Amino acid sequence: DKPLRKISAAFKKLAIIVNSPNPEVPVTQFSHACSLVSPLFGCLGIAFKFAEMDYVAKVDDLVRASSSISTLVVMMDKDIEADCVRKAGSHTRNLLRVKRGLDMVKVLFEQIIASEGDNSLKDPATKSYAQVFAPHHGWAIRKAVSLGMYALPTRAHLLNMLKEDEAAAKIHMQSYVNSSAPLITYLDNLFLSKQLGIDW
Numbered sequence: 001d002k003p004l005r006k007i008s009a010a011f012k013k014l015a016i017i018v019n020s021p022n023p024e025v026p027v028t029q030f031s032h033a034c035s036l037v038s039p040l041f042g043c044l045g046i047a048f049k050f051a052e053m054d055y056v057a058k059v060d061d062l063v064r065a066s067s068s069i070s071t072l073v074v075m076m077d078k079d080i081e082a083d084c085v086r087k088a089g090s091h092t093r094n095l096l097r098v099k100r101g102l103d104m105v106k107v108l109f110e111q112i113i114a115s116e117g118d119n120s121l122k123d124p125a126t127k128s129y130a131q132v133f134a135p136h137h138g139w140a141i142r143k144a145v146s147l148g149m150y151a152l153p154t155r156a157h158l159l160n161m162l163k164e165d166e167a168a169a170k171i172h173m174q175s176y177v178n179s180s181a182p183l184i185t186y187l188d189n190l191f192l193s194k195q196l197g198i199d200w
């Protein structure tokens with residue numbers, strides 16, 4: 001199968017949901033779509049190993065919760081009720097981390113699309129990391145990530161891993177960008193509308 005098309009197809013559906021008048025985002029559909037993004041960090045290599053703990057484990061948790069909890073709204077309401085929003089391992093806290101991962105990939109794709117004709121992924125990877133994850137990482141991690149940037153695959157190599165040529169990759173990557181933009185906005189507002197904040 002072709003991994004970018006599974007991503008675009010799944011997030012298009014979520015986009016339709018959050019673009020609708022009364023959105024109800026199922027934890028099952030949401031968490032499944034997010035797990036389709038996980039292979040991307042492995043492709044980029046050792047620099048993004050932090051995503052195992054900062055993203056993959058966070059998605060794993062939401063997949064667990066999806067068996068007993070209907071929607072993202074219901075999921076957050078439980079944590080608000082139990083006063084465990086910022087508690088380590090809480091579904092709401094993990095949801096916030098998942099949001100950041102989705103955001104980083106959105107920025108990554110945007111920069112890859114912009115830097116077409118350049119076979120180096122250095123700028124897209126460095127800029128996406130610096131914007132989304134760097135403010136949440138201590139010195140050691142940021143240095144390790146910076147070092148790992150030397151081990152990035154070439155742009156052409158990445159596309160080969162994803163099984164697309166330039167033209168087809170541009171379409172599905174842009175499709176994710178178009179879909180994740182309102183999804184990320186919807187997720188942010190779930191926090192902000194309850195004054196929960198989004199920078200913790």
Ligand SMILES: CCCCCCCCCCCCC/C=C/[C@@H](O)[C@@H](N)COP(=O)(O)OCC[N+](C)(C)C
Nearest residue numbers: 046049050051052053054136137138139140141144
């Ligand atoms: C041969 C040798 C190979 C050596 C292999 C080692 C390379 C892989 C290292 C993986 C990176 C660590 C993954 C951790 C991710 C999360 O825990 C992050 N939150 C950690 O960042 P931190 O800045 O400490 O989080 C903030 C927490 N704090 C505020 C309390 C600092």
